[PDB]
C-alpha cells in the first residue's frame, strides 16, 4: 500500500544502521505473527529494539514502541543480526557481539585499534561475519570460533558488503574506487569478478535472492544492475 505502519523518533543523532529481526527471548516467545521487530543504532551511542504491530494475520482480537535499549561506550556505525539465533553484531570503534538478552556486549571482536564501518552476516553459513574498516581492510570473523579470521588490505575503502544467498562462500564488496569486487572467501588473493560501470563511489551493494544478479548504488546519482558472470552493468536507473 506504500504507507507507514509506524514512525518513531528513535535517536537524537543520525541513524547509522538498521536491521529487521525476529528476536528470541529466552523466557518469552514474541508474537512474530502479529508483531515485527527492528533494531536501530546511531552515533548517540545507543542501540534500541522496537516492536511494530502488523496486519499480516487476523488470528487475534499491542505494547507498540520501544522494548529494550542498549548503551555503548563508543558511537555505533553498523548493525546486523545473526539469522539462526538472536545474537547480533554492531560496528563502531569496536565490532561487538551482543545477545538480545544482555544489556552489555557479550563478547568483543576486533583485529586491532582500527574502527569498523559496516558489517554483514552470511546467509547460509550463518556463523561467518564480514566487516569493513576505515583502514581500507576487510576482516572475516567466525562466531563458532569467536575470533577474527582473515584480513586483506585494498587500495581504497569498501563501503558495503553482501553475501551470495546461493553460494555460501562468495560475497561482493562495494568499493570506493568506482568498482564492485566479487570475492571468494577461501582464496581472497584474487577476486572472482570486477564490475566497472560506475563513475563515482559505490556506496551499497546487494544480491538478488536468486544469486544471479547484483545491484549497486553510487554517489553518481544512478543505480546499476550487473550479471554475476559479466563485468558490466546491463541497466542504469
Amino acid at each position: 500500500t506504500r504507507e507507514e505502519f509506524v514512525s518513531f523518533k528513535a535517536h537524537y543523532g543520525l541513524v547509522t544502521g538498521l536491521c529487521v529481526t525476529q528476536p528470541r527471548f529466552h523466557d518469552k516467545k514474541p508474537d512474530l505473527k502479529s508483531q515485527n521487530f527492528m533494531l536501530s543504532c546511531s552515533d548517540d551511542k545507543t542501540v534500541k529494539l522496537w516492536s511494530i504491530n502488523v496486519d499480516d494475520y487476523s488470528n487475534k482480537n499491542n505494547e507498540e514502541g520501544l522494548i529494550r535499549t542498549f548503551d555503548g561506550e563508543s558511537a555505533f556505525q553498523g548493525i546486523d543480526s545473526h539469522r539462526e539465533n538472536s545474537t547480533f553484531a554492531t560496528g563502531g570503534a569496536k565490532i561487538h557481539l551482543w545477545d538480545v538478552n544482555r544489556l552489555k556486549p557479550v563478547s568483543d571482536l576486533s583485529w586491532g585499534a582500527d574502527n569498523i564501518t559496516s558489517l554483514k552476516f552470511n546467509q547460509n553459513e550463518t556463523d561467518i561475519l564480514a566487516s569493513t574498516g576505515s583502514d581500507n581492510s576487510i576482516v572475516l570473523y567466525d562466531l563458532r570460533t569467536n575470533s577474527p579470521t582473515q584480513k586483506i588490505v585494498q587500495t581504497m575503502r569498501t563501503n558495503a558488503i553482501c553475501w551470495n544467498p546461493m553460494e555460501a562462500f562468495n560475497f561482493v564488496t562495494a568499493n570506493e574506487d568506482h568498482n564492485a569486487y566479487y570475492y571468494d572467501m577461501r582464496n581472497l588473493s584474487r577476486s572472482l569478478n570486477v564490475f566497472k560501470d560506475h563513475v563515482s563511489a559505490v556506496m551499497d551493494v546487494d544480491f538478488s535472492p536468486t544469486g544471479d544478479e547484483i545491484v549497486t548504488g553510487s554517489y553518481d546519482k544512478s543505480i546499476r544492475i550487473y550479471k554475476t558472470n559479466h563485468g558490466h552493468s546491463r541497466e542504469i536507473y
Partner: peptide, 13 residues
Amino acid sequence: ERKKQIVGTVHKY
C-alpha cells in the same frame, strides 16, 4: 585486473 586492488593479505598462501 582482478589482483590490482589488493595491497596485501595477512595470512599468505
